[PDB]
Amino acid sequence: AEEFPVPNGFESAYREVDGVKLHYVKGGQGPLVMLVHGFGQTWYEWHQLMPELAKRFTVIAPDLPGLGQSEPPKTGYSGEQVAVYLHKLARQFSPDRPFDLVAHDIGIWNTYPMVVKNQADIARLVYMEAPIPDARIYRFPAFTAQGESLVWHFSFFAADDRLAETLIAGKERFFLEHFIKSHASNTEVFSERLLDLYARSYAKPHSLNASFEYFRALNESVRQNAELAKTRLQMPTMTLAGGGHGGMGTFQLEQMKAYAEDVEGHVLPGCGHWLPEECAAPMNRLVIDFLSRGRHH
Amino acid sequence: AEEFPVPNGFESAYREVDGVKLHYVKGGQGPLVMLVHGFGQTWYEWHQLMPELAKRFTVIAPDLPGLGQSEPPKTGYSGEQVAVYLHKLARQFSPDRPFDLVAHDIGIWNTYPMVVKNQADIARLVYMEAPIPDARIYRFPAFTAQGESLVWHFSFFAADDRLAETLIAGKERFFLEHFIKSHASNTEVFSERLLDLYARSYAKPHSLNASFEYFRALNESVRQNAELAKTRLQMPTMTLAGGGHGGMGTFQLEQMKAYAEDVEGHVLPGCGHWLPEECAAPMNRLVIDFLSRGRH
Known part of the structure; x- marks a missing residue:
């Protein structure tokens, strides 16, 4: 069984990484793009x-x-x-x-x-x-x-x-x-229905706990990053943020300017925090175009 | 039926005020002092x-x-x-x-x-x-x-x-x-034992809801006070705050200076938010001494 429906042409699979069995969904051909979700959600x-x-x-x-x-x-x-x-x-x-x-x-x-x-x-x-x-x-x-x-x-x-x-x-x-x-x-x-799917996934006892352990490690992550940030990011970067209720607005790009030498940013009016769902069409467009400036299939 | 034990010589009673039945505990003789509790607790x-x-x-x-x-x-x-x-x-x-x-x-x-x-x-x-x-x-x-x-x-x-x-x-x-x-x-x-007493009280469904309604009204209270604060308090005032984990520290006095002409402040080391219980001896002493400057 799958927690979420897999798109046609994609496969749901697993790989061991350092002794931990990671789930992913994979499809397509060409150079690799990895997409990483956040809290409350999944792939x-x-x-x-x-x-x-x-x-x-x-x-x-x-x-x-x-x-x-x-x-x-x-x-x-x-x-x-x-x-x-x-x-x-x-x-x-x-x-x-x-x-x-x-x-x-x-x-x-x-x-x-x-x-x-x-x-x-x-x-x-x-x-x-x-x-x-x-x-x-x-x-x-x-x-x-x-x-x-x-x-x-x-x-x-x-x-x-x-x-x-x-x-x-x-x-x-x-x-x-x-x-x-x-x-x-x-x-x-x-x-x-979508809320039911996400809720059932994070309700698994180990997932409910995992969710919050990311936050219990947040101050440690801040301390780690204080040292890491001595090295600026050099690769082409794009930031996106929601300009509506729930969004980060100008904060996203303004923070990233401190980290990255080569960054462009967009704020999407009428969109909150959940860009891929709230504003799928413009978010998808901006991501596809930004990544397609590089070589691809 | 009492949620908490009354001290010897005090009475537990009620007064209807503007159609609301208020519970209180009362004792002693002389000028009146009213003590008003906060969130998570009672009298x-x-x-x-x-x-x-x-x-x-x-x-x-x-x-x-x-x-x-x-x-x-x-x-x-x-x-x-x-x-x-x-x-x-x-x-x-x-x-x-x-x-x-x-x-x-x-x-x-x-x-x-x-x-x-x-x-x-x-x-x-x-x-x-x-x-x-x-x-x-x-x-x-x-x-x-x-x-x-x-x-x-x-x-x-x-x-x-x-x-x-x-x-x-x-x-x-x-x-x-x-x-x-x-x-x-x-x-x-x-x-x-003490936590059992406080929890049983605020777990009453109407009390659990009431607790949070004070916070739901907080922004309204801020708006109210913006008008009221145009007049500074003129009576003798004392602030106390905890200097330990969970306490307000120097904030208490610093804010009060904007509100009161006559204010003295204390931060109690090794004490958090719950002063009457965490630090009964020094807190009680500060309060009794301050109030005893006036008629008693």
């Missing part, structure tokens, strides 16, 4: 981009360790530890050529270290809708004059006593709908 | 301080509307609305004389408006361990380099769709122990 957030991209590229979309159908990491959930798994997975499929990387949400946290440490392996980079973990995250407010803030969940999820698992278990679908919609401009794209 | 947080104050004052400690054994408010949960109930309650017992006020946590939110609107009714004021609702609350961080921040729960509790009640229902005792301890320096005072 499936990429399912609309995948067929289009596969016309020019070999496309792989893994489940993050512990999430979707991937085994939890055996090292840890800090950015540097998780990035090893994703880097090695990509290199199994693209051993002789650099590959492209597209990441969303905590996919950024879990890839930045392998990007900065293996720059010759990364042809082009697309980052959307999440801060790279650094001191900037400590500036986001706990509360706003309009109600709940964007990232109060960093504290909820990082809290000890398994606070998040204990409160959310048995209410996974309820919580995820609130969380997704509170970070969305276009809530209509999240059908009850 | 009981004051039970160690009460007998000491009762030697010089008439002491009343009400349960906030909807919490403890008090009915929910009929108007609403904003500071200005709730303050009417507390002001009227105090004035039933002290109709001809100003009274003293001691407030902790959301007790501050629920009393500030009646203090500024009825300054002549308030002889001396002690505020501890929470911001007065104003624009300063939007400057607290969601996340810190140590972990969970002081007030991320403002967003959790204020969130739409009854997010907090829905998640916490059936898990009130677990949640309260985490919330209290995460805001404490001296966690050891929160015995399983």
Whole structure:
């Protein structure tokens, strides 16, 4: 069985990486592009981009360790530890050529270290809708004059006593709908059915815990990145952010300018945090065009 | 039926105020002092301080509307609305004389408006361990380099769709122990027995909801206070804050200086948010001494 429907022409498969069984969905021919999802989701957030991209590229979309159908990491959930798994997975499929990387949400946290440490392996980079973990995250407010803030969940999820698992278990679908919609401009794209699929995946006990372990490692990731960021990113980079309710707006590009020498950015009006679903058509277009400036099938 | 044990010589009683039945515990003789509790607790947080104050004052400690054994408010949960109930309650017992006020946590939110609107009714004021609702609350961080921040729960509790009640229902005792301890320096005072008492009270469905309605009204309270703060408080004031894990530190006094002409402040080392319980001896001493400067 599969947690999410696989697009025609794609295969669902697994590879062992450093003793951890990773799930991914793969299709297409040409140079490799790896797409990395974030919290609340799985490889499936990429399912609309995948067929289009596969016309020019070999496309792989893994489940993050512990999430979707991937085994939890055996090292840890800090950015540097998780990035090893994703880097090695990509290199199994693209051993002789650099590959492209597209990441969303905590996919950024879990890839930045392998990007900065293996720059010759990364042809082009697309980052959307999440801060790279650094001191900037400590500036986001706990509360706003309009109600709940964007990232109060960093504290909820990082809290000890398994606070998040204990409160959310048995209410996974309820919580995820609130969380997704509170970070969305276009809530209509999240059908009850789509929410059911995502909720059932992250409700698996080991996946519910894995979800929050990424946040419990966030401060460690910030400390790791403080050292890593001494080396600037040199590859062509594009940032995308939502300009609507729930989005990061200008923050995405402004932060990335501190990290990357060669970066262009777009803010998408009328779109929140969940770009691949809320604004599939323009997001897909911008990603396909940016990656197609390089050689492809 | 009592949720918490009354100190010897005190009485547990109720007063109907503007159609809302308020529970309070009362004892002592002399000028009136009203003690107002905060989130996660009830009048009981004051039970160690009460007998000491009762030697010089008439002491009343009400349960906030909807919490403890008090009915929910009929108007609403904003500071200005709730303050009417507390002001009227105090004035039933002290109709001809100003009274003293001691407030902790959301007790501050629920009393500030009646203090500024009825300054002549308030002889001396002690505020501890929470911001007065104003624009300063939007400057607290969601996340810190140590972990969970002081007030991320403002967003959790204020969130739409009854997010907090829905998640916490059936898990009130677990949640309260985490919330209290995460805001404490001296966690050891929160015995399983004491936590059982507080949890049983706020787990009443209407009390769980009431708890969060105070946070849902927070932005309204901020808007209310923007107008009220145009007049500075003139009566003697003291602020207390914890200097240890979970405490407000220097923020308490610094904010209060913008609100009050006459203010002295203390930060208690090794103490977090829950001053009456974590640091009873020094906190009680500071409060008793400050109030005993006036008539008692």
